[PDB]
Amino acid sequence: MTDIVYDVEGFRAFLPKETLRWIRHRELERKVGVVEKFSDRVGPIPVEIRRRRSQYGEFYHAGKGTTRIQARVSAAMECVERAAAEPREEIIERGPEGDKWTPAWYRTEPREWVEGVDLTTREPVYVPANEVFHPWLGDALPSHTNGLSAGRLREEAVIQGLLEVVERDSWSIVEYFRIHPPELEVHGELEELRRSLEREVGRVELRLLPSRVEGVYVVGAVTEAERVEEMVMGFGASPDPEMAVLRALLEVAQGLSMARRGIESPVRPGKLTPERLKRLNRHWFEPEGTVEIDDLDRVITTGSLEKLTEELVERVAEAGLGKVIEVDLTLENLDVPVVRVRVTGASEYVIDEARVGNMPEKPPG
Numbered sequence: 001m002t003d004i005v006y007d008v009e010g011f012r013a014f015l016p017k018e019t020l021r022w023i024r025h026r027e028l029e030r031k032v033g034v035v036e037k038f039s040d041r042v043g044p045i046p047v048e049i050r051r052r053r054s055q056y057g058e059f060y061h062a063g064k065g066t067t068r069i070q071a072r073v074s075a076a077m078e079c080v081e082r083a084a085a086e087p088r089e090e091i092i093e094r095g096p097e098g099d100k101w102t103p104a105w106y107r108t109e110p111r112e113w114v115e116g117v118d119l120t121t122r123e124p125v126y127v128p129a130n131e132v133f134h135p136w137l138g139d140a141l142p143s144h145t146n147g148l149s150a151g152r153l154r155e156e157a158v159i160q161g162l163l164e165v166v167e168r169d170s171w172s173i174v175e176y177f178r179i180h181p182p183e184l185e186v187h188g189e190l191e192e193l194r195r196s197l198e199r200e201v202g203r204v205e206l207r208l209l210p211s212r213v214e215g216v217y218v219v220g221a222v223t224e225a226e227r228v229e230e231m232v233m234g235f236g237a238s239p240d241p242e243m244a245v246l247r248a249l250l251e252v253a254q255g256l257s258m259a260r261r262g263i264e265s266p267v268r269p270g271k272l273t274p275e276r277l278k279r280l281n282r283h284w285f286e287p288e289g290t291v292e293i294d295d296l297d298r299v300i301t302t303g304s305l306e307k308l309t310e311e312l313v314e315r316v317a318e319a320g321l322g323k324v325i326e327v328d329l330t331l332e333n334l335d336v337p338v339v340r341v342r343v344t345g346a347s348e349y350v351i352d353e354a355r356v357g358n359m360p361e362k363p364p365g
């Protein structure tokens with residue numbers, strides 16, 4: 001029964017100051033190939049940028065938070081998760097004995113597998129290597145990083161990775177059916193933050209996305225700006241709607257920081273105009289209805305880290321989105337818990353159009 005001591009950007013068993021101290025002591029950024037660091041501030045939001053070398057090349061990773069410490073931990077752990085997610089032969093099986101998951105789009109039988117755990121049944125289940133590692137080039141569709149997460153404890157990572165999967169499922173639902181989600185109305189500090197970021201662009205608008213998992217809220221933030229590359233989107237997912245909002249706003253700040261450095265990002269042909277971009281994306285700029293953040297029920301109340309993991313897993317398993325699978329990606333040398341979470345029927349349409357998942361005929365209205 002581990003206590004949740006921090007629940008601003010995410011649910012953590014440690015304060016960010018302790019974690020930063022711990023990242024530095026263990027020299028994680030150096031060990032993972034960080035070669036350059038930059039510090040930005042987008043309105044009031046610290047953004048951290050990392051340049052990382054590996055055998056696969058040179059990558060830019062970003063971190064952010066409400067505080068400079070949190071931004072620096074976020075950037076460091078983002079680098080760690082990516083390093084951990086690189087293909088590793090030590091844990092690939094080719095003649096696997098047990099249950100296997102073969103995604104819909106696989107026309108042919110996959111040859112490389114990694115063993116995970118089904119989180120409902122606790123039974124072993126094999127996942128394709130292309131569904132675990134990044135980058136992986138051998139298979140039918142591109143590798144990606146959805147569901148991937150690092151933490152101080154494996155529970156932190158499962159929570160964060162699972163919420164990421166729900167987040168991209170909701171966004172995929174919105175895009176595929178071109179749903180117009182309602183505007184989300186917020187107060188106090190969150191509103192002041194929205195206002196403060198808005199001063200950086202033209203408009204910052206909040207949306208409550210349809211969520212296919214009960215007790216999890218998904219929030220989108222969309223911008224309007226006179227420069228087109230500063231019209232970005234941010235997303236957050238949490239049983240706590242205030243966290244969902246914060247993470248969406250933080251992701252906008254991250255996006256704005258990347259655009260201003262001209263960093264090409266799948267992580268954050270002929271030049272478009274701001275007004276045409278609005279018209280191509282009217283579902284985001286013409287919301288259907290309004291929601292008050294106060295009228296949202298706190299279904300899952302956040303006590304202990306194990307109980308919260310258990311609860312979110314249950315809710316996902318109940319949603320009609322297939323199996324909830326965890327694959328361990330902890331490196332031997334750095335003792336940093338990293339997982340890949342798969343929800344076998346969760347949509348990943350926004351990443352690849354062939355990753356449709358369990359899609360209904362008519363959208364949930």
Ligand SMILES: Nc1ncnc2c1ncn2[C@@H]1O[C@H](COP(=O)(O)OP(=O)(O)CP(=O)(O)O)[C@@H](O)[C@H]1O
Nearest residue numbers: 012016019064073074077078081149150151152160
């Ligand atoms: N206080 C903390 N302690 C340990 N790990 C943390 C942490 N805060 C963030 N992380 C980890 O660092 C990475 C960056 O997380 P962040 O909070 O910035 O959201 P995110 O990066 O998942 C959005 P995206 O997947 O699109 O890049 C994640 O693996 C996250 O779990």
Ligand SMILES: [Mg+2]
Nearest residue numbers: 145148149164
């Ligand atoms: Mg992530």
